[PDB]
């Protein structure tokens, strides 16, 4: 946590349907866009932390 | 404080004007049906 390993995503077609629709995951909240939007809206670039 | 009000930020459709939504109906989220059970990717439509 104090140390995070960034990850830089860009230049693609950005599926996130698989992640919305993912039952692995114990939690899936968005903040600044919808998450059923996410496979619609674009973004210039994507970052994971 | 004061939660007694209440407002709607789930509906699957933009409303028509002058129109009054009284909806309690779960508002799905996921692919899933919601049975009237929310949970995960069932959310109940109305914020305090």
Same mark, same amino acid.
């Given at each position: 946590?104090?140390?995070? $390993?960034?990850?830089?995503?860009? $230049?693609?077609? *950005?599926?996130?349907?698989? &992640?919305? $629709?993912? !039952?692995? +995951?114990?939690? +899936? ?8 939007? &996410?496979?619609?809206?674009? =973004?210039?670039?994507?970052? !994971?932390? | 404080?004061?939660?007694?009000? &209440?407002?709607?930020? +789930? ?7 002058? %129109?009054?939504?009284?909806?309690? %109906?779960?508002?799905? *989220? #996921? ?6 059970? %929310? #949970? =995960?990717?069932?959310?109940?439509? &109305?914020?305090?």
């Amino acid at each position: 946590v104090y140390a995070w $390993n960034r990850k830089r995503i860009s $230049n693609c077609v *950005a599926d996130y349907s698989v &992640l919305y $629709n993912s !039952a692995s +995951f114990s939690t +899936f909240k968005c903040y600044g866009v919808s998450p059923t939007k &996410l496979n619609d809206l674009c =973004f210039t670039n994507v970052y !994971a932390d | 404080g004061n939660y007694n009000y &209440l407002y709607r930020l +789930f509906r699957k459709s933009n409303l028509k004007p002058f %129109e009054r939504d009284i909806s309690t %109906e779960i508002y799905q *989220a #996921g692919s899933t049906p919601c049975n009237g059970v %929310e #949970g =995960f990717n069932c959310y109940f439509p &109305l914020q305090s």
